[PDB]
Amino acid sequence: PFITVGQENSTSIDLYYEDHGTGVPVVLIHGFPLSGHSWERQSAALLDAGYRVITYDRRGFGQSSQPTTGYDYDTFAADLNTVLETLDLQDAVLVGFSMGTGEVARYVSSYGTARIAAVAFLASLEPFLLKTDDNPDGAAPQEFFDGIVAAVKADRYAFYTGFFNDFYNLDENLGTRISEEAVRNSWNTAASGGFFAAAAAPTTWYTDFRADIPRIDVPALILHGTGDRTLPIENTARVFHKALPSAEYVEVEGAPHGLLWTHAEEVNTALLAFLAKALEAQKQKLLTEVETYVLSIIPSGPLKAEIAQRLEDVFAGKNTDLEVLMEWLKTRPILSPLTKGILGFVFTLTVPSERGLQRRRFVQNALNGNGDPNNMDKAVKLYRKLKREITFHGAKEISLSYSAGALASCMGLIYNRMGAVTTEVAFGLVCATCEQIA
Amino acid sequence: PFITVGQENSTSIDLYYEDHGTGVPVVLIHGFPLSGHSWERQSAALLDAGYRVITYDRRGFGQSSQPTTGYDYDTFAADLNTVLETLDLQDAVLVGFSMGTGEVARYVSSYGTARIAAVAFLASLEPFLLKTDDNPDGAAPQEFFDGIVAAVKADRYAFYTGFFNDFYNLDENLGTRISEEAVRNSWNTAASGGFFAAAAAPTTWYTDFRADIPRIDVPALILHGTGDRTLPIENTARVFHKALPSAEYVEVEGAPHGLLWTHAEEVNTALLAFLAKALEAQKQKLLTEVETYVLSIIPSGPLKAEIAQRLEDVFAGKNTDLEVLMEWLKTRPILSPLTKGILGFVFTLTVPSERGLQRRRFVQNALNGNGDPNNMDKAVKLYRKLKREITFHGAKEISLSYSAGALASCMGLIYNRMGAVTTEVAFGLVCATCEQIA
Amino acid sequence: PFITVGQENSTSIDLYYEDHGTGVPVVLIHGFPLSGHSWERQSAALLDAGYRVITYDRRGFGQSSQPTTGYDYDTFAADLNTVLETLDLQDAVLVGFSMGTGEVARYVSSYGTARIAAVAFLASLEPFLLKTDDNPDGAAPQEFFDGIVAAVKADRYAFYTGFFNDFYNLDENLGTRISEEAVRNSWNTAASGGFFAAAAAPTTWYTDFRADIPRIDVPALILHGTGDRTLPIENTARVFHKALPSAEYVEVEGAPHGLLWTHAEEVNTALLAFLAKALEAQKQKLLTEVETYVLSIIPSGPLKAEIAQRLEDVFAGKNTDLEVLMEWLKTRPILSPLTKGILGFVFTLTVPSERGLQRRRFVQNALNGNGDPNNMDKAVKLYRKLKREITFHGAKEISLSYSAGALASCMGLIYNRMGAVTTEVAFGLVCATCEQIA
Amino acid sequence: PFITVGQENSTSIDLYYEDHGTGVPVVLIHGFPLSGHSWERQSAALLDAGYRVITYDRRGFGQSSQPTTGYDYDTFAADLNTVLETLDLQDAVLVGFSMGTGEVARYVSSYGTARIAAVAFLASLEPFLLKTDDNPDGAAPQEFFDGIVAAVKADRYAFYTGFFNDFYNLDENLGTRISEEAVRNSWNTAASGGFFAAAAAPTTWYTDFRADIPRIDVPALILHGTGDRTLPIENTARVFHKALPSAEYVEVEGAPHGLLWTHAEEVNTALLAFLAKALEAQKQKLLTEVETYVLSIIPSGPLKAEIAQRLEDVFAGKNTDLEVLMEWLKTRPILSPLTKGILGFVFTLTVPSERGLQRRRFVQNALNGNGDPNNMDKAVKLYRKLKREITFHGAKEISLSYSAGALASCMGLIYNRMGAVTTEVAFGLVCATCEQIA
Q: In this complex, do C211 and A370 lie within 8 Å of one another by their Cβ atoms?
């Protein structure tokens, strides 16, 4: 999987990326000198939570192309933009690490937050690493960074074993937090990166992000290890917190630079808690929007109030039994048979608890749609398009070009387990079905 | 509904007919001077038993056209042939009444019994009505029949009231077995017949059928009323029974000529019992044929013996619970998931007791067929053709031109209640599904 | 005249129907156990009023085919749907009686009101006949209806004479409101129905229509007799009125179930008055909408005020002469030739009084539309397309994909031959033409 | 080299594969957690024997894409199917190892054996690994496998070194059977796999294959090491041998799981011997079947004996010259001109040694078939269909619906330009041609 973000002579600058899971898109940007595969502990935890994990390899690292030009944050953010634009993400989450934290800051301060819902800074570079007369809060003078560059060009491979010794704090965590095998893979990944990239990357570390900090208008998370040797916490996160007090500040005690692996349990807890708070504000306003379309089929009466409560008590996450709901939904005098099926179909997608039991029949007969051969044929044409779709807005638009009978029958195909589209797309059908019946 | 069976000048000789129900085709041939609608009590009883009732109106009577030529049993049988050939009936049952009994007798001695399974003669004309020197066992001389023709040509409408007085024995059964209203409708039917038909029909009553009797090689049923005034029992059924001793002989006590309405309860019981005996020999040979194809998917072993027993215990009609069956079918180690669905699909079609309950899931997952948009699309094209089909052999041949994945998906459409074909066509799918997996 | 609406085995389910008169389509759906001919008193009055009467026979009744399957309102509405779709009816009125009220209700609640302008319920079944614990407002328990079913299967012909005694109240109205001959004919119709239909029809009377009632968004008329014996007014219309208060409610005192014949003068008066009222409401609601678009092309000034008064005085029905109007319209200083044509085109479609005189020339010269060969060609392509459209909103949409000059030229085509298209469709062009010049 | 087999969100599921050599296609399916390159010792031996080696990397392993969905044998077989269909393999050989044996079993039991000639199971999973109450022949309960899954997500890299310790038996074979360098690379391959794949793959090990076993109708080879630590021989191959006794059973003494490298010499010898034996049996089973049909056209006499020996001397592989054969075939007294052509047609398809003869003329004149314009046209309709056919039974059935003259002319099409079609399909025409002349 590749995304063209540039061009170098006869070759094209392509970035390797992965797109897994369904839900809120979370973009994970790795740091020096690893690849996208270094998020493998965070990806798994986010996928279990129900998020959409999107990781990519930076130019000159991992499985991505290895150009010899465009190694600055204006280009790195530009590359990030192209990735976000191609996948067309809305209300996504940018999570950066080490060198990766710089790309997030430069993008938000240059391209806005039209696509961003929240941000997270793990072991940040912010606000400035270069120690000058203007900022004593730097970590080192220019003579230090220049020494690293000369060391890499000397022997890039030998530099890694010594670098990773301070990256994971092997004298404290090896065999404990991180195995010797895990260190070997991290070495292999760095060696499979661009030779010119590893020599040009350190020259981007001392970039000034001070002008970009106050441009953060989205919920932020500043996280850093206390035992970080590569990036001293006192020269980074401590002064970053002062520039952005509104950001959630979390210190992991006794954590090295590569705390993505060593202190994964610690990072994931603070990260899942941050996402659960900032995204919850957005999560509920779409659920009521679904509730809006569903209630637009219920006739005004005492039931429209009761049905709304049965939905809201489920949308929050309060425990509810399907047997009571499906039976009360069945024995309803005012509700038409068609809308009974749609409500039962929603009730099945909103409750995690199937009870490991049978299927219902009153909904199957409603979602049949008169069993017309030509109307049902237009339902399988829809199923092919819904399997290829990913977003909520994408599913609604496609299933709005089909007849009302087709949508019902298409809802029948997925309910009778003759298909398997995503949860975001599943709601896209219902909301499209309800708009047509007006 | 009409069937062209002839041609007269500028007009075409068409016969009105009806085709109801599914199962063993039973052709009901009415008598003088009523129509096919006079079987409405036998039709209802035959439809509840699970047979396929096919009734048609004879030329010059009922809703059929009213020609002035071709009023003989050689033509009447010829018309019956065209109907049987057009509808393409196999192993059908010919049931005649009054004048109608002559057509059944006349058809069998000319076209064979390739399409006939059994015959039934209610108030027959056989073997001869004309009392001559060759047969003293006649019912009347030529002078009697000639008197009837002259009576009809005098006043065909007035002839009916007097005719129906002895047809239903109104001096005995009026207000008891048959209402005056039912007689009125019977009058209306006779008055809406051909004027020339009613005058030519009696000339066919004294037709000799003695050469046609021994050509009957199928199980027959001779039934007649004892109080029959139009057709004296001693001159018809009594000597008919001697000519064909192998036929089941049943006399209804105190029954008039029109015993189709008056003694319906008596007739329906004797007719269904006769049908239940002659048709049962064929009923079981198709069930074992389904069993034959179904067993061709089960791998040879101890289960193939148990599954055969599970099929036979259901096909006979012994009470069985689906919950035990569906669970035992589910928890089977050797059976593949695909064949589990087919067995469950058969088990659902063979037991009348759904318990008014839910559907099963292990079969739904098997009949999915990998949920491919193109494979499922080939399943709905089949469903359109299966709704229009009627016979078992017809359903099998059509659904044998489609892929195995389509058949599985098509079985899924009907199982998930997204369609509703007949039991005979349902087995046609199963038998087609099992033939392709070989 | 027949319309194929289904398929049963070898036979095709066809429905007999009649199409008389020209004007606003009024579909009359009869009840049990009569035919379309039972509207013969309402039909004559509607034909005299200038409407288009369309009556059809329900499956299993009258001259229609007599199948043994599909006896439910979902099917009855489906048959109704097929009739409405096949005939391509525009702005029609659905009027039901007895069972016919159920077909109207099931259709509106399943297929919408895209083709429906108004509805009428004469002696309705709504909302529920089955008296249960959930609904005490029923008329009888299921044991009563089952007694009816058993009575029909006993002697369908004899059942009719007793049924019609309470249908028309013969012990009260015979020889007065209804003759003995009219009763005799009604019997023949019932006797000419399906034997299976009459035994299956009563099981549809106790169908729940409570879920169908609130889907009624068109002007309705609930009418019922007070002396209705078959359908008690207190168990039907009284509780129906509560479910739909917006419907005009009219009770005929001392009227039986079959009030279509006995109190014909009263019904016809109330029905014609309701249509004349309800259609006037739509006639006027399109005229004020047209006035909005027409005044949106006239430049603000004293004339934009004067033109509005001349329009309102015509739309209301105040007497006006075209000669003064058309001449005063000609000698107008501010109005462009194009907009002069639009006003003249409206004036010809809005006044019933043409005086039986000539056409005008200044508008024909105005409706040319610059005489562009490509614009005029798109106008004849349009005139063919406007004939297949039905709604006002439908007419507007088609004529919105063409240039303003083409619309003007298309208005000339309609000006020369109207019409073809209808006034409701004609205004769709005008409102679209004035909308394009913005 | 990649083959698109699926779709995940924005990315496409592609599989890395290699295609080497020419001849009988041999598909090598690797196991957990290696790649296709682990066959490098088996690949070399198969390429020397004259086979066509086709290896691919399972989704989530090796150089193939790394999705987070579709990790089950139903999907794995589907992927294998897509590979076989895209490459269009006919009479291929499926060889599986570890997880690969499951893919072979699931494919044969789901997609049939139309493309498969023989199968081989090296260190199989069959029939069941999960030890339950239903199957005591398991190796471990579910609690064991769940411990492995938790171990991978803990530290996937460290898990490998311990896994390979029992995979190759490093406490027994290190420095002996397998070098330290070879172990490092095997680690690298596993480390270059999907992080989610390695955590999801073990959950597929305890899959039930008991329903897939009896669908094996092709010659099989069950091979397993005695010192296998990962897959206990007593819980796999031993009970598998009982389920499929017809399969060749071979135990390698003191061989670990990864006996592909350690005991390469033993495996390669036994595998090449099985293929050389099993394919020889079918090649010959088509030759004797053709010989059966060919001798059925020759009249009984000395030639029918002579023709059989000339065939047998060819079927065995004894050197024979065509010039003598084609000339001796010409100068034959009993044989008709028609049958001379058919014999010459067989002789060209059976000898690898063409002798450097362009083609013969006496057969071309024989295969004309009277040169009828309508008959040659029926030969090209067949020729287009035989190219799309793959199997022997498929070619025979199609070419049995044509006249004998058409088959001859069709044989002429194949005789001048073969081919297109293949020899297995070529014999299908011949066997059909000789069968039609009877």
A: no
In the DSSP assignment, the letter for residue B35 is -
Long-range pairs for D337-341: beta carbons < 8 A, 24 or more residues apart: D337/D365, D337/D366, D338/D366, D338/D408, D339/D297, D339/D298, D340/D366, D341/D365, D341/D366, D341/D367, D341/D408, D341/D411
CATH topology of domain C367-438: Arc Repressor Mutant, subunit A (1.10.10)
Q: What is the CA radius of gyration of chain A?
A: 26
Give the list of residues 6+ apart from residue B301 with CB closer than 8 angstroms, or none: B334, D214
User: Which two tokens mark A190?
Assistant: 């760095």
Residue range(s) in chain B whose domain bears CATH number 1.10.10.180 = 365-438
Q: How far is the C-alpha of A279 from the C-alpha of B204, rounded, in Å?
A: 92
- Looking at chain B, the domain(s) classified CATH 3.40.50.1820 span 1-279
CATH of domain D280-366: 1.20.91.10
CA–CA separation, A418 vs B370, rounded Å? Answer: 9
Residue B399's CB is within 10 A of a number of other CB atoms, namely 26
Search chain C and give the residue with CA nearest A369: C110
Residue type, D188: N
What is the phi-psi region of residue A188: left when phi exceeds 0, alpha when psi lies from -120 to 50, beta otherwise?
alpha
Architecture of the B280-364 domain: Up-down Bundle (1.20)
Structural class in CATH, domain A365-438: mainly alpha
D208 touches chain B (CB under 8 A): yes
Radius of gyration, alpha carbons of chain C: 26
* DSSP β-ladder status, A14-20 and A52-56: antiparallel
Contact between chain D and chain B (3 or more Cβ pairs less than 8 Å apart):
yes
Terminal-residue alpha carbon distance, chain C: 49
Between strands C220-225 and C248-252, the pairing is parallel
Which residues in C lie closer than 8 A to residue A373 (C-beta atoms)?
none
Identify all chain A residues contacting B409, using CB atoms and an 8 Å cutoff: 418
| Token pair 């105190």 in the structure block, residue | B254
Best D7, D157, D185, D187 residue to mutate vs chain A (most A CBs within 10 Å): D157
C228–chain B nearest CA distance, Å = 25
- Dig out the tokens for A169 from the structure: 């704090």
Residue contact C211–A335, C-beta within 8 A: yes
Q: What is the CA radius of gyration of chain B?
A: 26
Integer CA distances (angstroms), D383 to A232, D91, D365, in order: 78, 21, 19
Asked how this structure was determined, the answer is X-ray
Residue C218: count of CB within 10 angstroms of its CB: 15
Is residue A53 within 8 Å of residue A47, measured between CB atoms? Answer: yes
Give ranges for CATH 1.20.91.10 in chain D.
Answer: 280-366
Beta bridge partners of C118: C93
From B186, B228, B263, B399, the catalytic residue? B228
Which tokens belong to A391? Answer: 């977003």
The domain made up of D1-279 is a member of CATH 3.20.20.140: no
Q: DSSP string of C309-360?
A: HHHHHHHHT----HHHHHHHHHT-SSS-HHHHHHHHHHHHHH-S--TT----
Active site residue B228: yes
Instruction: State the count of interchain CB pairs (< 8 A) between A and C.
Output: 17
Tell me whether D388 touches chain B (CB under 8 Å): no
Which residues lie below 8 Å from residue B434, measured CB to CB, with a gap of 6+? Answer: B293, B294, B296, B297, B342
Q: How far apart are the C-alpha atoms of A414 and A395, rounded to whole Å?
A: 14
